Design a binder for this molecule. Structure first.
Ligand SMILES: CCCCCCCCCCCCCCCCCCCC(=O)N[C@@H](CO)[C@H](O)CCCCCCCCCCCCCCC
Lengths: 335, 52, 214, 291, 211
């Protein structure tokens, strides 16, 4: 009724306000910036997965890395010696995400079973066992990310995100503003805000404290699969099944730069930044990964070392590597 | 309906947010890149990297 | 986390509470000192015996989660000790020392025994080794064990810098090259001899030990 | 002809085998996931590759007038390699036929109990049998110097010298080595024919013979194992049953044709990759994407 | 070289052997999807077997089947359907018996059969509620959903046309074989076993080169 007219008026107000701030685009501003053509190479192959690899996450020490694959396997590796450290047997092989806690004590996993399993690594007994099972989520998990050793946020195709309390096991904040399926998720360094890109073609910056959505961006034509924070905390880039990546600034609330090429018509599955927020690394599903200069919006490198879709990728906190896990069942560390 | 009112409030809260001109935001973006990429290995390697 | 074993002239570890099948196992040897006995790893792949008693036997069973010599040599009259050590990145080998029972290569010299120490004061214990204890990977190998009187040894500082679980944060160890040290800041009554350990080579020599009188 | 065509066929087999076997051990060897079928193809490629690497020595020996210009150790090693790997190929052909027959006829079992571990623990059986059947090649071969100094490369029994007993042991141990045929043609040809006819019958009766692919490549393999091994196992069979009349009198037809049928027999080694590995579409795509 | 990293590579090789052993018994159970509109008795077929994704495993003639039911997920299908790339077969359920539209099921089949993740994966179609369909078609013409043709109004005729249409939804005919069926049907799991054995034989012939 009148609200529909009111809703349209509010949307028009938002659009006009957004258009007002557009002082300039990254093209003109960054024209006076030197492009990075980096070409990493396989320094280690991490074999031992017998099925598709969807998830990886880098440990905080830039030394260990965890990989979740359809083999019902969550392998904790050693990036240098390649000697596998742990092999956690997941009780639900349909995993779509994993996360390595900042303190290294815990590791996250989750997937079509829409149960966020928090596994405990450092225990008196040698084995690695599951600590908590975060349930009550009517979609499928897509990305878990630890805030501390007791708080984790999980996004699902349940049109909802959630901040939990691993101690009590009960969802303590529900983030429900979207209208499609939330496919990605990433935490700001402050661990006070986080972004989630959904199948609505929209991304959203939320507020873990207040318990309420803060900003919604719409710059894409189809499902979003990846989103990751620019390490300064107030920007984030994202990738969509429409073969395009876009950069957003949370304070500017607008779209800033686009990353696409005419030849590529494939999809995107993971996006991560460099340590300095200069290299935008994105895992396309044309059987290889891509590397851009986010600021200059120019193609700068290809990680073509797989025979299947490059699903997940991550960059160490030390910044001295990048690990890509594709559907070829092989992790690959590049430097 | 109630869902319409909830959506109206959800857009209303986002209406009054403060914003800055994209020049300043892009300036911050490239500042954080240039003044912090002297250490980034994937840009300029890691003369003796631990992945040798 | 619970190792109890049983045993005793002329002729000749019921582990519980942890995943034995993925842990290495040793043995360690009179009211004088301690020295290495044998070794085994997960899966019974690599077995090192002690040079002094080479070829005279260590053997494990994982489903049983537990066995151990042939000649009653004079030096064999001692108190043998049972330890576990899982070897992966960032682990704490020799973490748990069992109670134990009764019955060339790098060596460490201390010669600093019998240092009298009072509560509340800070104390330091030295440790000199023959060669350098630093593999090329960056790890310095020294496992500062404390032997409280009438009790099994305990790990304080594994790999010569890291601190093991349960140890209060007052303990700390350092020292590079060959000469090492262990430091206690605010000594307490339950901190009354200290034993070094090398791990670069197969023979796990210890060193004499420095008793702290209180 | 009958003195030049064998050399040309042997050389063509050598070069084609080297190339194809290298392709199989480089694409199916390294650049493909390890499975039972890949194990069998890689082992067969390795067998044929060792054989075709030994092949230039054989072609030089034949061209130089049935001689051995190379050293005694070189000739001994090359004949050991040929004897081990020719049997390796002719046995791994039968092994792959058995694998395909047990995968098609009995698929439930071939899924429940056919893993890479079993494949690697049984694939060395043919190699062990090849070693057993090639021991009488290392044991009773040495360089023999001709009175004219030609120093040909044949068998000898001087290490075992009484001409009566020496010649008796010579004849008996040369007519014992029937084996080239009974366990070099009868077993492998029988296995290939029976197993592949069985799978053709099974995939006809059950239906699902959609295109003209199956009945083509399933008879091409039997034909390429028969029309390229049978003349050797007829000439050598005859020789092994006419040893007397060829060693005392000079039936010169049989010896007059050993080189042609030898070239035809060796052509199978070069043909095998183009018949077991390149046929599969997945391998073709993997090779195309590899290089 | 190695001091205790020599004991770390030992742990690595031990758990690598454990992974390989698990994969041997992981690639031993035949994986099998299950889909449907929701009114179709996929619940019925899983009930007759000798939140989130539902797992069901069973045995028949020493072949371990593992069925995956996902209809409990009311999310975007184009995001979790690619995870089931390696499934040997897809059991599809369509209810022959017009409560709302049936056309939705036909649209679903086109979205599963012609889906790019299932070009070589066979679909075991299942027309359920055969008894109700027979007792229903007399009371209501088949034209209400099939204006084009209703034909003879006996079950052996109308169901023949529905089956013919569903086969005709095959956007590709070279690879996929739609082992259709009807289902108290006690010989059902045997039919799934025959179809899966046929698919396994076809795959073995494919990677053996004979296809
Ligand atoms: C002190 C006195 C010392 C002795 C003095 C001389 C002894 C008296 C005369 C004896 C003659 C021998 C010595 C003469 C020297 C050579 C002259 C011609 C000899 C001659 O006719 N040689 C024929 C037959 O012997 C031919 O070269 C034999 C080849 C090997 C058998 C295999 C059959 C072919 C199969 C080919 C592939 C096999 C490998 C694949 C296995 C699957």
């Amino acid at each position: 009724d009148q609200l529909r007219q009111e809703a349209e008026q509010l949307k028009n107000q938002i659009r006009d306000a957004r258009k007002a701030c557009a002082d300039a685009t990254l093209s003109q501003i960054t024209n006076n910036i030197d492009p990075v053509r980096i070409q990493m190479r396989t320094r280690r192959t991490l074999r031992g997965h017998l099925a598709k690899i969807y998830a990886m996450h880098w440990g905080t020490d830039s030394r260990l890395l965890v990989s979740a694959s359809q083999d019902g396997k969550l392998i904790i590796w050693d990036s240098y010696t390649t000697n596998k450290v742990h092999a956690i047997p997941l009780r639900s092989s349909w995993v779509m995400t994993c996360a390595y806690a900042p303190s290294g004590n815990y590791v996250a996993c989750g997937g079509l079973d829409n149960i966020c399993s928090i596994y405990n690594l450092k225990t008196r007994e040698g084995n690695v066992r599951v600590s908590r099972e975060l349930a009550g989520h009517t979609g499928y998990l897509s990305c878990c990310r630890f805030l501390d050793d007791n708080q984790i946020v999980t996004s699902s195709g349940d049109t909802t995100c959630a901040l939990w309390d691993i101690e009590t096991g009960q969802q303590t904040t529900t983030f429900t503003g979207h209208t499609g399926d939330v496919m990605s998720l990433s935490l700001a360094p402050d661990t006070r805000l986080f972004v989630s890109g959904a199948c609505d073609a929209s991304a959203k910056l939320w507020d873990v404290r207040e318990g309420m959505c803060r900003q919604t961006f719409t710059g894409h034509e189809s499902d979003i699969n990846a989103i990751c924070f620019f390490p300064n905390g107030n920007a984030f880039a994202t990738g969509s099944d429409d073969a395009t990546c876009r950069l957003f600034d949370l304070r500017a609330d607008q779209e800033l730069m686009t990353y696409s090429h005419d030849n590529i018509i494939c999809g995107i599955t993971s996006v991560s930044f460099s340590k300095s927020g200069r290299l935008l690394l994105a895992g396309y599903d044309d059987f290889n990964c891509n590397v851009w200069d986010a600021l200059k919006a120019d193609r700068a490198g290809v990680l073509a070392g797989h025979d299947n879709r490059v699903s997940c990728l991550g960059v160490t906190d030390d910044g001295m590597a990048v690990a890509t896990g594709s559907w070829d069942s092989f992790l690959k560390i590049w430097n | 309906i109630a869902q319409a009112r909830k959506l109206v409030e959800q857009l209303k809260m986002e209406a009054n947010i403060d914003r800055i001109k994209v020049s300043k935001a892009a300036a911050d973006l490239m500042a954080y890149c240039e003044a912090h990429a002297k250490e980034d290995p994937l840009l300029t390697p890691a003369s003796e990297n631990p992945f040798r | 986390v619970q190792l109890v074993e049983s045993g005793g002239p002329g002729g000749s570890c019921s582990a519980s509470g942890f995943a034995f099948s993925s842990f290495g196992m040793h043995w360690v040897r009179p009211e004088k000192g301690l020295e290495w006995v044998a070794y085994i790893s997960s899966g019974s792949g690599t077995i090192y015996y002690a040079d002094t008693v080479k070829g005279r036997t260590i053997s494990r069973d994982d489903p049983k989660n537990t066995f151990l010599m042939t000649s009653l040599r004079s030096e064999d009259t001692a108190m043998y000790y049972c330890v576990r050590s899982i070897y992966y990145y960032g682990s704490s080998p020799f973490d748990f020392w069992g109670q134990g029972t009764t019955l060339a290569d790098i060596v460490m010299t201390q010669a600093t025994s019998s240092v009298p120490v009072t509560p509340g004061e800070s104390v330091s214990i030295s440790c000199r080794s023959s060669k350098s204890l630093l593999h090329s990977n960056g790890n310095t190998y020294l496992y500062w064990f404390l032997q409280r009187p009438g009790q099994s040894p305990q790990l304080l500082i594994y790999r010569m810098s890291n601190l093991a679980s349960g140890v209060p944060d007052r303990f700390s160890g350092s020292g590079s090259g060959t000469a090492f040290t262990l430091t206690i800041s605010r000594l307490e009554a339950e901190d009354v001899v200290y034993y070094c350990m090398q791990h670069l080579e197969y023979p796990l020599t210890f060193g004499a030990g420095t008793k702290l009188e209180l | 002809v009958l003195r030049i065509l064998p050399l040309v066929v042997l050389g063509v087999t050598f070069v084609l085998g080297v190339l194809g076997n290298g392709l199989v051990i480089w694409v199916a060897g390294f650049r493909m996931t390890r499975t039972v079928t890949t194990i069998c193809y890689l082992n067969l490629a390795l067998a044929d590759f060792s054989f075709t690497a030994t092949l230039p020595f054989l072609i030089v020996s034949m061209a130089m007038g049935e001689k051995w210009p190379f050293g005694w150790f070189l000739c001994k090693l090359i004949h050991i390699v040929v004897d081990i790997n020719l049997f390796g190929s002719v046995f791994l052909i039968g092994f792959i036929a058995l694998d395909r027959c047990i995968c098609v006829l009995h698929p439930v079992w071939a899924q429940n109990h056919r893993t890479v571990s079993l494949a690697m623990k049984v694939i060395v059986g043919p190699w062990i049998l090849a070693l057993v059947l090639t021991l009488p090649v290392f044991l009773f071969l040495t360089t023999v110097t001709i009175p004219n100094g030609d120093t040909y490369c044949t068998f000898n029994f001087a290490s075992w010298g009484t001409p009566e007993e020496r010649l008796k042991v010579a004849i008996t141990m040369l007519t014992a080595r029937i084996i080239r045929f009974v366990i070099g043609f009868s077993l492998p040809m029988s296995i290939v024919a029976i197993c592949y006819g069985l799978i053709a019958a099974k995939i006809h009766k059950k239906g699902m013979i959609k295109s003209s692919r199956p009945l083509r490549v399933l008879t091409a393999v039997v034909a390429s194992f028969f029309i390229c091994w049978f003349p050797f196992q007829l000439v050598a069979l005859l020789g092994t049953v006419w040893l007397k009349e060829m060693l005392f009198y000079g039936y010169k037809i049989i010896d007059i044709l050993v080189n042609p049928t030898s070239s035809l027999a060796f052509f199978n080694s070069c043909l095998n990759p183009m018949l077991y590995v390149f046929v599969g579409q997945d391998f073709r795509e993997r090779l195309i994407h590899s290089l | 070289l190695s001091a205790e990293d020599k004991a770390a590579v030992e742990r690595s090789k031990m758990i690598d052997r454990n992974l390989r052993e698990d994969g041997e018994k992981a690639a031993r159970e035949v994986k099998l999807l299950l889909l449907g509109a929701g009114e179709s008795g996929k619940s019925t077929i899983v009930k007759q077997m000798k939140t989130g994704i539902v797992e069901t495993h069973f045995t028949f003639k020493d072949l371990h089947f593992k069925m995956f039911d996902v209809g409990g997920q009311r999310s975007e299908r184009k995001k979790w359907i690619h995870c089931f790339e390696g499934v040997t077969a897809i059991i599809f359920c369509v209810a022959l018996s017009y409560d709302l539209v049936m056309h939705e099921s036909m649209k679903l089949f086109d979205s599963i059969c012609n889906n790019k993740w299932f070009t070589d994966t066979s679909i075991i179609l299942f027309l359920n509620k055969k008894d109700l369909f027979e007792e229903k078609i007399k009371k209501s013409p088949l034209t209400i959903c099939y204006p084009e043709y209703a034909g003879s109004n006996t079950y052996e005729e109308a169901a023949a046309y529905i089956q013919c249409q569903f086969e005709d939804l095959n956007k590709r005919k070279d690879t996929k074989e739609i082992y259709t069926h009807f289902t108290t049907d006690t010989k059902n799991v045997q039919f799934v076993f025959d179809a899966v054995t046929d698919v396994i034989i076809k795959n073995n012939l494919k990677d053996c080169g004979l296809f």
